[PDB]
Amino acid sequence: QKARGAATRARQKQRASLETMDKAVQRFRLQNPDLDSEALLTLPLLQLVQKLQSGELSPEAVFFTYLGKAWEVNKGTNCVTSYLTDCETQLSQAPRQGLLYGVPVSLKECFSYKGHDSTLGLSLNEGMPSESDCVVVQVLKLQGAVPFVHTNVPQSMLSFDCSNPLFGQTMNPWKSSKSPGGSSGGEGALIGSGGSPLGLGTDIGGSIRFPSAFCGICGLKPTGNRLSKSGLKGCVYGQTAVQLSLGPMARDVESLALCLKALLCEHLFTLDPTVPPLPFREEVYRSSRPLRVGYYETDNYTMPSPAMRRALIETKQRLEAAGHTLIPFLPNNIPYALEVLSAGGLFSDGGRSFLQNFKGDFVDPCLGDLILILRLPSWFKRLLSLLLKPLFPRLAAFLNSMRPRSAEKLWKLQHEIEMYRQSVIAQWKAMNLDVLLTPMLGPALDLNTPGRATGAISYTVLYNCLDFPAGVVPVTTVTAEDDAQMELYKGYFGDIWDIILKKAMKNSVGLPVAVQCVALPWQEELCLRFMREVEQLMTPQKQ
Amino acid sequence: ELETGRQKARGAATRARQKQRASLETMDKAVQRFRLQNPDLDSEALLTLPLLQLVQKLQSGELSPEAVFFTYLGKAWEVNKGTNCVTSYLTDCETQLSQAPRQGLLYGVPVSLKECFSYKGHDSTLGLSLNEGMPSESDCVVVQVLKLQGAVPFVHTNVPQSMLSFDCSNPLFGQTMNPWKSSKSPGGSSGGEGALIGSGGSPLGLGTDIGGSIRFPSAFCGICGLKPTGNRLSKSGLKGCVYGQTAVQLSLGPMARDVESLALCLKALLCEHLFTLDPTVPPLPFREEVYRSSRPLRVGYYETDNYTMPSPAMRRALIETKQRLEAAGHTLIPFLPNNIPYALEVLSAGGLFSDGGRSFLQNFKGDFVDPCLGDLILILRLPSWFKRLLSLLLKPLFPRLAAFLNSMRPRSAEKLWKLQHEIEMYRQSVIAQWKAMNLDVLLTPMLGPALDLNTPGRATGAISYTVLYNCLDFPAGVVPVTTVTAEDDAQMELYKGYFGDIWDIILKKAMKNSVGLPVAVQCVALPWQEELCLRFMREVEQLMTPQKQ
Numbered sequence A: 001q002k003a004r005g006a007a008t009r010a011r012q013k014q015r016a017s018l019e020t021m022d023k024a025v026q027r028f029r030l031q032n033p034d035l036d037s038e039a040l041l042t043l044p045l046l047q048l049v050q051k052l053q054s055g056e057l058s059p060e061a062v063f064f065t066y067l068g069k070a071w072e073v074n075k076g077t078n079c080v081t082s083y084l085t086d087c088e089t090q091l092s093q094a095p096r097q098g099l100l101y102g103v104p105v106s107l108k109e110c111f112s113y114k115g116h117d118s119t120l121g122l123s124l125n126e127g128m129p130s131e132s133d134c135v136v137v138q139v140l141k142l143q144g145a146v147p148f149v150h151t152n153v154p155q156s157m158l159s160f161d162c163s164n165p166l167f168g169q170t171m172n173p174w175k176s177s178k179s180p181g182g183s184s185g186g187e188g189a190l191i192g193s194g195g196s197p198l199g200l201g202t203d204i205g206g207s208i209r210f211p212s213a214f215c216g217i218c219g220l221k222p223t224g225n226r227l228s229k230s231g232l233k234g235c236v237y238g239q240t241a242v243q244l245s246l247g248p249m250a251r252d253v254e255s256l257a258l259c260l261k262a263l264l265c266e267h268l269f270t271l272d273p274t275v276p277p278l279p280f281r282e283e284v285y286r287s288s289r290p291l292r293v294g295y296y297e298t299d300n301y302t303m304p305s306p307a308m309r310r311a312l313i314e315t316k317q318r319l320e321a322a323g324h325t326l327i328p329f330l331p332n333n334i335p336y337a338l339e340v341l342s343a344g345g346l347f348s349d350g351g352r353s354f355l356q357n358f359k360g361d362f363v364d365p366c367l368g369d370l371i372l373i374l375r376l377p378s379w380f381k382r383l384l385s386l387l388l389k390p391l392f393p394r395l396a397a398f399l400n401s402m403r404p405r406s407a408e409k410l411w412k413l414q415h416e417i418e419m420y421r422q423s424v425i426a427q428w429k430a431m432n433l434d435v436l437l438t439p440m441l442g443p444a445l446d447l448n449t450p451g452r453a454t455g456a457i458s459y460t461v462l463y464n465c466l467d468f469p470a471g472v473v474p475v476t477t478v479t480a481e482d483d484a485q486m487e488l489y490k491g492y493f494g495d496i497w498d499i500i501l502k503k504a505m506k507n508s509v510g511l512p513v514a515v516q517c518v519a520l521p522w523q524e525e526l527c528l529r530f531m532r533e534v535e536q537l538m539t540p541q542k543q
Numbered sequence B: 001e002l003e004t005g006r007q008k009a010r011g012a013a014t015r016a017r018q019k020q021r022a023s024l025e026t027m028d029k030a031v032q033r034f035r036l037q038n039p040d041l042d043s044e045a046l047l048t049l050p051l052l053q054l055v056q057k058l059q060s061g062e063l064s065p066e067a068v069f070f071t072y073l074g075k076a077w078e079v080n081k082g083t084n085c086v087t088s089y090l091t092d093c094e095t096q097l098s099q100a101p102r103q104g105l106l107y108g109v110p111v112s113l114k115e116c117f118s119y120k121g122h123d124s125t126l127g128l129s130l131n132e133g134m135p136s137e138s139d140c141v142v143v144q145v146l147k148l149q150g151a152v153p154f155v156h157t158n159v160p161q162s163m164l165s166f167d168c169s170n171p172l173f174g175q176t177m178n179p180w181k182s183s184k185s186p187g188g189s190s191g192g193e194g195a196l197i198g199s200g201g202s203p204l205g206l207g208t209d210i211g212g213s214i215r216f217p218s219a220f221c222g223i224c225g226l227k228p229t230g231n232r233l234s235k236s237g238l239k240g241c242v243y244g245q246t247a248v249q250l251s252l253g254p255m256a257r258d259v260e261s262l263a264l265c266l267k268a269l270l271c272e273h274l275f276t277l278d279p280t281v282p283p284l285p286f287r288e289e290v291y292r293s294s295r296p297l298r299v300g301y302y303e304t305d306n307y308t309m310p311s312p313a314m315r316r317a318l319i320e321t322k323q324r325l326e327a328a329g330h331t332l333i334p335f336l337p338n339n340i341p342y343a344l345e346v347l348s349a350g351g352l353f354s355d356g357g358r359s360f361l362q363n364f365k366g367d368f369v370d371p372c373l374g375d376l377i378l379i380l381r382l383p384s385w386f387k388r389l390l391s392l393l394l395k396p397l398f399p400r401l402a403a404f405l406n407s408m409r410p411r412s413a414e415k416l417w418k419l420q421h422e423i424e425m426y427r428q429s430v431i432a433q434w435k436a437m438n439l440d441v442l443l444t445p446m447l448g449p450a451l452d453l454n455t456p457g458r459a460t461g462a463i464s465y466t467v468l469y470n471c472l473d474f475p476a477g478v479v480p481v482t483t484v485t486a487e488d489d490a491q492m493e494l495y496k497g498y499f500g501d502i503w504d505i506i507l508k509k510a511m512k513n514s515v516g517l518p519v520a521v522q523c524v525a526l527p528w529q530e531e532l533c534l535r536f537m538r539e540v541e542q543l544m545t546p547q548k549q
């Protein structure tokens, strides 16, 4: 009843948003027929900002052209959830000396904006507009950047798919039957199709890296508190065991570094003193000195697809030819880190704070049985845990960690994560590494299957638990040779997560594959430096 | 559960006293052999000189690293006979003396360590029986960087049992006494550090802080101490009683005679060595331009926090430093943090005792309970229903005891997240209030003067001026300003307290007969801005004690 009314009123807001967008771009295109839209969109962000700084391209020109593309791609992707109205007034009042002057920036729905709903796919958050912009949006406006639209998220944001009962289902710009990723699926679909040159997204299980790999764009996940989490909307507040991180999303890695340099200014540390005043170290990013790179083709938990395995080896061979030393490195106790530390950290209360948002609301099929399993009693979760332990160890250990704990059990878990963080650093020091090469979950999965393939977060959620800066960059396209070899895929366990993932990665010719890059905590510039190296060797067209 | 007795704890303390006695014997044999070699070496001229002039004469070559070592080592031995602040002498330090890097910033500097800092082949007992007879395999990160910067760690300082008290007494190493007065407490939990530096045994030291453990002994003994942001320095290797507690942030910092030595210690620690060995700490360089800045500051201040009544000595110290800052050219604004009782009663007490002290009481199993902790142990051991029953009964009469006892109850993981979110919301609250008055720095009346023996554990509410900024994770420092006059101690009969419970009665009695004792002031800056905090601490020190600069 209430969920039905909230969905109907949200769709009216979306219709009004798209109608305002369409009438604004036609107003600009007819008044400015001299402007070339094709050369505008193909132009990289680094070439875009210098033409905006000099005055070759007006802030009005770059804004409504990208807005025109954003509205056109939304027809087949359904990624834009709300259009920000007062963006046209911000355009005229943009600071010239800002690093991102006249840059249209897409925002995830969790990023609160003045006079806009941060629904997150829930009914209780619908009809509650934010009365103030969040710190990271504030500094974008202070740095000249103009946020234009909000992007769609999956219900509750706790899934790497992208669908909600309020605004609908987001689709991959490359293939209709495929998921655009999540929970920044709206960001991936928009930037991947060329609707936005720059974007922002959150991450706690891989929410930046998933849609970036699925759509073929670059996304960075910084350390827990490298950027301001103030003003950000979520379902569970106070979860510190698994570190939540917000980061940039763009077409190329060079655009991510300029975004990070802009946000890491005086204005961020003034508006949020809780974030350490770490400036963007240009010296570390621009570095060309040979790196000692750790690598692994598989984490022995989730079997990589033929497209993933080929992408990891090709990057390795290109880096070896460049002069970088590649050393086989694998983190200790990975299944232990995912099953009881990562899953136990996110669900220490049994999901009781999480399920509070689902009271009197529809459940989206993209989540799957995620809600039905969490609603089970603590004794019923434990009973099925030791019963299915000899059958499938993955589902059993995950279900036991989704049980409610006490305050004593949380500290025991918090200390174990602190011990695990130091243990991997001990291995990082012993092997003497600068950066880490990791396969990224690819290619794009089918619609309503990511929620049923839980184990696939293994390559991403590990570095949320570790709180390591992780970033992804598209390196190759899925050749029909790789898609054919998906028939020999079986998995190490053969449980439901391996069965669904086998079917979901099929029929994926033309989809992009990315590779994950991991550096030591607080080293975002070093992570981006390696991301710059991987991109240059694999896709020389960019940069 | 079956009682194991105290027999295991008795033998552990017997072996702990021996390690203390043998240390002093090794210290005595070392300083006597040096004095026979150097008869014309001036000791009083060596000790009186500040660390800044000491490090300059060590870098130039005027004074040998051996000369400054054995002079301070002998002074540390002499003051220990009246203070009892040294637990153990680090045997492998004379080898480090010759191995100390000449180009290091702290070259040839004798540095005292708190027992929580783990040293290779040395016990970090913390006052507990189970922690003794358990030597550390390697030095901790912050001790490693001291050795890399040329500093020579030589002694472990005394701590109260479990470190959860601002007194300083343990059943294994004994009781620490204030170098200024015998009957007075030297502070805690870095009470050994305060007593050693305050008397002149150590020019520089390190200590932990989660409720004011750097700031308390600094004010009680009359020395400078800085508590930075929780994650500004490495916590790796630091031994504690409880692990996994992230609600209230644990912080570590420098302790010295003057403020200029604290900034040199922070600059030496903040180097490539620290960030490599512990990547969890952000690579923030020590901003010299901020510390050396002589620009006028917008300073917030308050005479009282409306929770714990300041002594006439505290009131006088706060006003005197406030007025002299105004004469310098600084603008002083009446500022008070919102909902202080909320931060202490339910956020700090609830954060530190989320499990009801269940992991904390694990260390006290079959071990002695030191009188300096008071009834803290007996209160924690009570069941959840008994803690709740007394909370409802004491609420109408004693509001402070009701909220503290209720927050010391075991809760679920759901309630911990709500609490941890309430802390970061409160952190954003005071930050928003900070901007509203557009402050640069904050001035707080630090708890003073020194309390009596075995009274700090019975006067819980006194941590109100210190634990507030552990909950807020604000870098706070302490600098001595003035001593107690005959008029200050005489006005203690007029002292009553804002609540009139047992905490105000004991604190009234504990601050009596305090003529001559030092009283300090607290300086608070915004998170991650401890270099700005020291800049203000330098301004306070220069205007109140110009002889230190």
Ligand SMILES: *[C@H](O)N1CCC2(CC1)OCc1cc(Br)ccc1O2
Binding pocket: A157, A158, A159, A160, A182, A183, A202, A203, A204, A205, A206, A207, A208, A343, A346, A370, A454, A457, A461
């Ligand atoms: C975005 O970071 N994101 C959060 C949820 C996610 C991945 C997508 O990570 C944790 C998790 C845990 C379970 Br039991 C099921 C699904 C996810 O997905």
Ligand SMILES: *[C@H](O)N1CCC2(CC1)OCc1cc(Br)ccc1O2
Binding pocket: B163, B164, B165, B166, B188, B189, B208, B209, B210, B211, B212, B213, B214, B349, B352, B376, B460, B463, B467
């Ligand atoms: C060192 O920071 N330190 C820890 C214990 C202390 C002060 C000294 O702070 C917390 C606390 C809590 C209670 Br209920 C009683 C006493 C203290 O002291």
